[PDB]
Design a protein around this nucleic acid. Structure first.
Ligand SMILES: CCN1C[C@H](C)n2c(c(O)c3c(=O)n(Cc4ccc(F)c(Cl)c4)nc(C(=O)NC)c32)C1=O
Ligand SMILES: CCN1C[C@H](C)n2c(c(O)c3c(=O)n(Cc4ccc(F)c(Cl)c4)nc(C(=O)NC)c32)C1=O
Ligand SMILES: [Mg+2]
Ligand SMILES: [Mg+2]
Ligand SMILES: [Mg+2]
Ligand SMILES: [Mg+2]
Ligand SMILES: [Mg+2]
Ligand SMILES: [Mg+2]
Ligand SMILES: [N+]
Ligand SMILES: [N+]
Ligand SMILES: [Zn+2]
Ligand SMILES: [Zn+2]
Lengths: 368, 184, 368, 184
DNA sequence: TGCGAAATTCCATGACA
DNA sequence: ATTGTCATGGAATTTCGCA
DNA sequence: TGCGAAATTCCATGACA
DNA sequence: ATTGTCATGGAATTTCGCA
């Protein structure tokens, strides 16, 4: 500080202060003659307060904070001192946006069999129809075969009623859902345990994880819309038609309908495929097992040039789910406990709880 | 002649009256001919209306080429005929007083009746809730004649609820004496 | 039809029906033996109805409609008949999504001078503060210099009051705004005409067009958020501070603050730049004119591989602005009258009105 | 000595009482020393409070190094001194009874008074609305001494409202006789 | 006439209802 | 009759200090 | 053994609150 | 303790019909 600056004034060389410049005293302040002009060298013990004042004018990042400082001052490695403060500004860390993309998505394996895994979700509220407001959508992961159920609410009780009708046909090993109240209730957990079904939840606020059913929701709304053009939105009576319509629609990439993938033969619907008319059921089920294993599988896409990847012990911040007006979009920093996979992590949150979270709802804390 | 297939023919029939359960009195029974797969629907009456409402649910999942029944009023009504025609379903009736299905269907229908009777004694009023488990049992019950359950034949896979405990299906001495006392 | 199919049965060659296959009669229907199996050839007069039935099952596009048809039938060029119907299905055309990206954005020239062009917009409703709910934001296009005004409503009357205070300093040539009610009222037009100001409106529902002010809104909210962390959202008293804070913040790409670009010299704010202390005002204004013309300008980015570009007479569809639940997201087709630039067009809408519209709110109607 | 600049010194002063306009009675006048640029603020009183409230608006746009005034109570209060100190503004007072500015400021202040007087006769009550146009006039008025208007000196550009019609600024014979009648 | 490190520039990311 | 923008912080590139 | 056109496959775009 | 998906219609590529 006043120590360093003394040695410097009497022509001695101190590390980080290039010897080729003339350092002088004026108005009781150490000054230097830099290409850009004459700047003040504050003593080390002053520097933190200067950076902070510059930064706080508008809570600026690296370069805009630096530019303010460089107006009056020079010292060795100013940006290192600038960055040090940015890493300690709680308001910047929790308010600023990320500028790093997540790593490329995983394309999980298609469940091997019908009934291995169900994906479920609510759509709504829709306009009232017969006093119903929601749709429970159930999609078999392997086949894409879908079941639709109108409900008055996205509730456990309505879900249980619907699943009781569905599970009359078959029991699935796993049901996958987002963390909506209907699916996270202990009533629903009891119901699953009673029947040997394992419940598997998406990371919170990451509907990509329930992508199978989410994508079916789109087709469901799309078909409902087309059918209701120029009529009032009386959709209740249409659900059964939509269900049947979608379950018998070809996926151009697969060349099969979800009904075909489930049963290996069309029922008595329009334009029924007749290719296996001469096979026995046994031969038919044989060809079916073969079809089911040879289905096209997409692979993980190229990473973006500025993706980041979670590392154990790293400081990361969870996205605020439903941020209020003028409130930060990010929670306080937290620590990566485990990396479950390149797109999913467990974090310890400062409270400190364990939370399983999508990398898409995280940013790495800046400036370490 | 081409080999027999699922959805070739559904065999349908009513069971009841039964002791009221959630206000229901009958069960519409649907059995796939080729697989022996059973769907059950609780109704309030054996009417054309209740039949249509029930089959509308089933046929939003799969549509049979042929429905076969006896000459029940609900199945012979012109309303039920309009319904079938709309959907491209050919209707088929057995001659009056002389019901014919196939060995497979006859046996399955026997099991359904016997399995229902077993579970309604002791709790004659709770059968509505039991319908789902009855169906799983029936559908994951091994077929002596073919090597497979209806589930396996319909879906081409093993089930996650195998019913390894092929039950008595007979009334125990308790169930016999307290079934003759329930209607007494 | 029954004509063509007759000649075909008696071994004659008809164009489009490959001679190498055996065409026969069975059950009163012309059949052919194709690699995939035996298919029915319907008479031409039947074909439209078949395509339509196939299509209407679930309102499927090209390949999924085709796959249904190919189950039972064959005829020459089925997809041409399939596409013909898709182009005529009103419900598909107005409900389906686009799969073509817009052309790359324009980067309009920076206004040459302060006061050439103002960009204005409302932010809000925000939480009540002193009974105010909105902010009028005014951004000078050349400098980025910004004025903030709290209002109770996004109204013409509040806009007029605010602009009267602002225009005390200087009158701008053009004020640019989106088409919010406050800016499109005839009261506001009168007010502009009275003062020689030209009003210039964004294409509707395309806030990119007001990008200059929209981008400032973000910084305004961002700074307000940081300042309000852990306190109640009493933002009214902060507006003046934010205004001053932002107008004096460096843009790292430009190396200037909006205040500097407006005045050519810092006022008495913290870390004021001192580089022109020895110049006269005249020398200072001279260097300023030079700075203003040499500012960095971004250029139009590369087009995406599947962008489309509007052509006069083309059928295009406007995006529905605020679509209701289960209602189509696209209006009926309309016609491109003029191409104002590669990203902006005038369309005639079927009613038929002239509408100036962003290409981002258009898709080209599929299947011609 | 370094050359004079905008924001080096703001000269401030009050005008009034005036005939009430939207409940306002005074005008706080701010003139930049170097450019001759004028900002006007309507107040309800020449108090420290009204001064602070007005200058808070101006200083959210630009902050002077020095404010100069006469020894008005509003400017000599310790509240106004706390305000200036908070903002790094040095305050400057002319000796009592002896007001000094510069030639430029003196002339500008003369124009302001004369231009106000001209417009308040006939409509002594509508001056609040007229403030914006008064300012544009003053600020786009050519300086005989320098070759430029205040606008040009402050922004380094021509203005979009050039006031090519340098007006009389004198009272016509009508305005003289009906100004002596307004206060009679 | 070239090294290691600091400075500056580059630029994808994301948010403006 | 109109039209994206630009703060941000790691990475990439250039310049600086010294020899 | 190669041509023109039809068929099929490819794949960016966008929407699932 | 978990993880994107897939209908869509122009374009690109492959195959077909015929020689
Ligand atoms: C309350 C529990 N909960 C959490 C959030 C509300 N959530 C729930 C949903 O079902 C969805 C949903 O369908 N989409 C639509 C969407 C958007 C982008 C996509 F990529 C995909 Cl696949 C789907 N979004 C959200 C959401 O997270 N919005 C911010 C969402 C849910 O139930
Ligand atoms: C009623 C007149 N009106 C029309 C629409 C409502 N609008 C108006 C706005 O001010 C905004 C606005 O700020 N943003 C935020 C935004 C989103 C993406 C961007 F790229 C950018 Cl630059 C800005 N969006 C919309 C909007 O169009 N949402 C669908 C918007 C407006 O006033
Ligand atoms: Mg959900
Ligand atoms: Mg969802
Ligand atoms: Mg009967
Ligand atoms: Mg707006
Ligand atoms: Mg906006
Ligand atoms: Mg005075
Ligand atoms: N997987
Ligand atoms: N331009
Ligand atoms: Zn900060
Ligand atoms: Zn359609």
């Amino acid at each position: 500080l006043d120590a360093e600056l003394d040695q410097l004034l009497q022509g001695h060389y101190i590390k980080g202060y290039p010897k080729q410049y003339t350092y002088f005293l004026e108005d009781g302040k150490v000054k230097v003659s830099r290409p850009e002009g004459v700047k003040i060298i504050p003593p080390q013990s002053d520097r933190q307060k200067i950076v902070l004042q510059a930064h706080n004018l508008a809570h600026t990042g690296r370069e805009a904070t630096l530019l303010k400082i460089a107006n009056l001052y020079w010292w060795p490695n100013m940006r290192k001192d600038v960055v040090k403060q940015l890493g300690r500004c709680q308001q910047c860390l929790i308010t600023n946006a990320s500028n790093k993309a997540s790593g490329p998505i995983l394309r999980p394996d298609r469940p091997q069999k019908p009934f291995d895994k169900f994906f479920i979700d609510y759509i709504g509220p829709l306009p009232p129809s017969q006093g119903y407001l929601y749709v429970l959508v159930v999609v078999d992961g392997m086949t894409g075969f879908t079941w639709l159920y109108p409900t008055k609410a996205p509730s456990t009780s309505a879900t249980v009623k619907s699943l009781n009708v569905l599970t009359s046909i078959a029991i699935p090993k796993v049901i996958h859902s987002d963390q909506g109240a209907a699916f996270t209730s202990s009533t629903f957990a009891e119901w699953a345990k009673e029947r040997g079904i394992h419940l598997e939840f998406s990371t919170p606020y990451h509907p990509q994880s329930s992508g199978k059913v989410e994508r079916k929701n789109s087709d469901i709304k799309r078909l409902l819309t087309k059918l209701l053009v120029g009529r009032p939105t009386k959709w209740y009576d249409l659900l059964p038609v939509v269900q049947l319509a979608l379950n018998n629609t070809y996926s151009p990439v697969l060349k099969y309908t979800p009904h075909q993938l489930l049963f290996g033969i069309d029922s008595n619907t329009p334009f029924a495929n007749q290719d296996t008319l001469d096979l026995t059921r046994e031969e038919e089920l044989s060809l079916l097992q073969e079809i089911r294993t040879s289905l096209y599988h997409p692979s993980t896409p190229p990473a973006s040039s500025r993706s980041w990847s979670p590392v154990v012990g790293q400081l990361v911040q969870e996205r605020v789910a439903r941020p209020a007006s003028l409130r930060p979009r990010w929670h306080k920093p937290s620590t990566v406990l485990k990396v479950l996979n390149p797109r999913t992590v467990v974090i310890l949150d400062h409270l400190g709880n364990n939370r399983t979270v999508s990398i898409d709802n995280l940013k790495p804390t800046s400036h370490q | 002649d081409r080999p027999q297939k699922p959805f070739d023919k559904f065999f349908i029939d009513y069971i009841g009256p039964l002791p009221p359960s959630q206000g229901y009195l009958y069960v519409l029974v649907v059995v796939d001919g080729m697989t022996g797969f059973t769907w059950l629907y609780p109704t309030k009456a054996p009417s054309t209306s209740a039949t249509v409402k029930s089959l509308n649910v089933l046929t939003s999942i799969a549509i049979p080429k042929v429905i076969h029944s006896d000459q029940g009023a609900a199945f012979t009504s012109s309303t039920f005929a309009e319904w079938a025609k709309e959907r491209g379903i050919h209707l088929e009736f057995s001659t009056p007083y002389h019901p014919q299905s196939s060995g497979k269907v006859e046996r399955k229908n026997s099991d359904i009746k016997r399995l229902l009777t077993k579970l309604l004694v002791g709790r004659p009023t709770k059968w509505y809730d039991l319908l789902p488990v009855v169906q799983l049992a029936l559908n994951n019950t091994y077929s002596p004649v073919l090597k497979y359950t209806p589930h396996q034949l319909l879906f081409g896979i093993d089930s996650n609820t195998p019913f390894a405990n092929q039950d008595t299906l007979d009334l125990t001495r308790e169930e016999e004496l307290s079934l003759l006392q329930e209607i007494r």
